[PDB]
Amino acid sequence: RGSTELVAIVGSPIAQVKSPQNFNTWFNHNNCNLAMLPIDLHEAALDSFADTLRGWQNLRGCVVTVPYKQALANRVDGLSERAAALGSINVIRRERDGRLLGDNVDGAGFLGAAHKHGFEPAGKRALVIGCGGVGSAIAYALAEAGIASITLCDPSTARMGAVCELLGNGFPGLTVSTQFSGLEDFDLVANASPVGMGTRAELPLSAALLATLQPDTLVADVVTSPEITPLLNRARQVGCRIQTGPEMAFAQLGHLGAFMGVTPLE
C-alpha cells in the first residue's frame, strides 16, 4: 500500500461520487496496485491543488467533476482539441515530468452508451436539451461523429448562442437550429439539463411536444438520480429505446481510465 500508485477525483462536494468504488472495484478484480481516492477540495485551494498535482509523483491522473471542470481547464499545461473548444475538462493525466494534460470525455461517454443502444450518429438528427457544460460536450461529440443536424433548446439565450457558435464554426457541414415544432424528425432526443433530477422530478418538454415522440427514436438522459426520469419513463412507454445517466457515466469510466493511463479503452 506504501507503493500503491494513485488516481483521484476532485470536486466539491465529493461524497456522492461513484468513480472511486467503480475504479477500485475494477482495480481489485484485475489485481492492480492502483487506487482512486476522493478529494473534496475547497475552491480557495484550486491553484495550490494544481501545483500539488505537478509535484505529486506517484499520482497518475485526476478526474474533475463539479464545479471545477472549467476552472481546472484553465490551470492545466495542455488541452486536447475538444477540451480546448469546450473550455472544460473532466480528466487530467499527470505526465512523469509533472505536466498536467486535460481532456473532456463527457461526449465520448455519451456516444459510447449510445452505440450500445445501436445509435450511429453519422447522417442523423439530434435534439439536445440543455446547452451547458454537459450539453455542449454532447453536441460537440455528435458533431465530430458526423451527425447531419443538431437542434438545441435552452432557456439561456446566451448559452444557446454560444453552442450555436461552437458548432457553427467547428463544423461547416453541420446544420444547426433552435427552432422546431415537433419531435417526429429527431433520431435522438437527449436531455442534458438538470430537469429530471430528484424525488420531485419534472419534465423538460411540454406535453404537446412529448405527444409527438416517435417509437424509433433513441431518448437519452444525463440525470443520474432517478435513473429513470419522467422523460425516460414516457419514452419507454412509447416504445423508444432509452439511455440513462448511469449508462453514460459508466461508459466514461472506460475513457477516463485510458486518458489517465490506468485502464484500457475497454
Ligand X SMILES: NC(=O)c1ccc[n+]([C@@H]2O[C@H](COP(=O)([O-])OP(=O)(O)OC[C@H]3O[C@@H](n4cnc5c(N)ncnc54)[C@H](O)[C@@H]3O)[C@@H](O)[C@H]2O)c1
Residues that bind ligand X (CB under 6 A): 106, 109, 129-135, 153-156, 159, 192-195, 197, 204, 222-224, 245, 248-249, 252
Instruction: Assess 71 for contact with Mn ion (CB under 5 A).
Output: no
| 164 in a known ligand binding site | yes
Contacts (Cβ under 8 Å, ≥6 apart) of 125: 147, 148, 149, 150, 151, 185, 186, 187, 188
240 marked ligand binding residue: no
- Pick one of ligand X, Mn ion, none as the site partner of residue 133 (Cβ within 5 to 8 A by kind): ligand X
Closest listed residue to residue 62, CA positions, set 103, 106, 31: 103
Which residue lies nearer to ligand X by CB, 34 or 220? 220
159 labelled ligand-binding: yes
Give me 68's grid cell.
471545477
Residue 32: name its binding partner from ligand X, Mn ion, none (Cβ under 5 to 8 Å by kind).
Answer: Mn ion
Residue 133 CB, shortest distance to ligand X, in Å, is 4
Q: Which does 164 bind (CB under 5 to 8 A by kind): ligand X, Mn ion, none?
A: Mn ion
Is residue 21 within 8 Å of residue 28, measured between CB atoms? no
DSSP secondary structure code for residue 95 in this structure: P
Q: Binding site annotation covers 36?
A: no
- How far apart are the C-alpha atoms of 132 and 40, rounded to whole Å? 23
Nearest distance from residue 72's CB to Mn ion, in Å? 26
Q: Which entry of ligand X, Mn ion, none binds 4, CB below 5 to 8 A by partner kind?
A: none
All 3 cell numbers of residue 87? 473550455
Handedness of CA 93, 95, 98, 101 (dihedral sign): negative
134 assigned binding-site residue: yes
> In which residue are the cell numbers 445509435 written?
119
User: Within 140-199, which residues bind Mn ion (CB under 5 A)?
Assistant: 153, 164, 176
Q: How far is CA 13 from the centre of its chain?
A: 18
Contact partner at residue 144 from ligand X, Mn ion, none, CB < 5 to 8 Å by partner kind: none
Residue nearest to ligand X (CB): 132
Min CB(35)–ligand X separation in Å: 22
The CB-of-123 to ligand X minimum distance in angstroms stands at: 25
Active site residue 124: no
- Comparing CA positions, the residue from 218, 202, 203, 222 lying closest to residue 134 is 222
* Selected catalytic residue, list 18, 69, 116, 124: 69
Strand 91-94 relative to strand 59-64: parallel, antiparallel, unpaired? Answer: antiparallel
What are residue 38's phi and psi, to 5 degrees? -85, 135
Which residues line the annotated binding site for NAD(+)? 133-134, 154, 159, 197, 222, 245
Residue numbers annotated as active site: 69
